[PDB]
């Protein structure tokens, strides 16, 4: 977030770390006529896959991507429910 001067809607706001964006070469490459607008490219993309969607990153780090999707299921309600029990959330098999 800091290096790219971006914020998660709940995250902190920092300084640019590269204060000059002002230099722009007038050139054909990124011109609108040559671009296809599908999907907005929200920030959370640019923070998620920083090298891909974000042109010219510097001092950026690798986000860690994914985890197993914990299925953990536990009971805080009754103390006398057994330890091993088939919870109605599960599918019937």
């Amino acid at each position: 977030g800091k290096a790219l001067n971006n914020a998660i809607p709940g995250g902190p706001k920092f300084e640019p770390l590269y204060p000059r964006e002002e230099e722009e070469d007038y050139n054909e490459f990124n011109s609108i006529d040559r671009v296809i607008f599908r999907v907005p490219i929200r920030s959370e993309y640019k923070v998620a896959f920083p090298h891909l969607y974000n042109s010219r990153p510097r001092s950026v780090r690798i986000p860690w991507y994914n985890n197993p999707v914990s299925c953990i299921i536990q009971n805080d309600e009754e103390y006398d429910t057994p330890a091993l029990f088939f919870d109605p959330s599960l599918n019937p098999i």
């Binding site: 001067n5 809607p9 300084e15 907005p40 920030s43």
Partner: peptide, 27 residues
């Protein structure tokens, strides 16, 4: 989310840097 709108940061701009979508022009 900060989509590229707003300021590089609100320091010298004296404002609060508070940005909000415009209900005005959509369709």
């Amino acid at each position: 989310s900060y989509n590229g709108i707003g300021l590089k940061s609100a320091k010298g701009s004296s404002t609060s840097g508070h940005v909000q979508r415009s209900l005005a022009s959509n369709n």
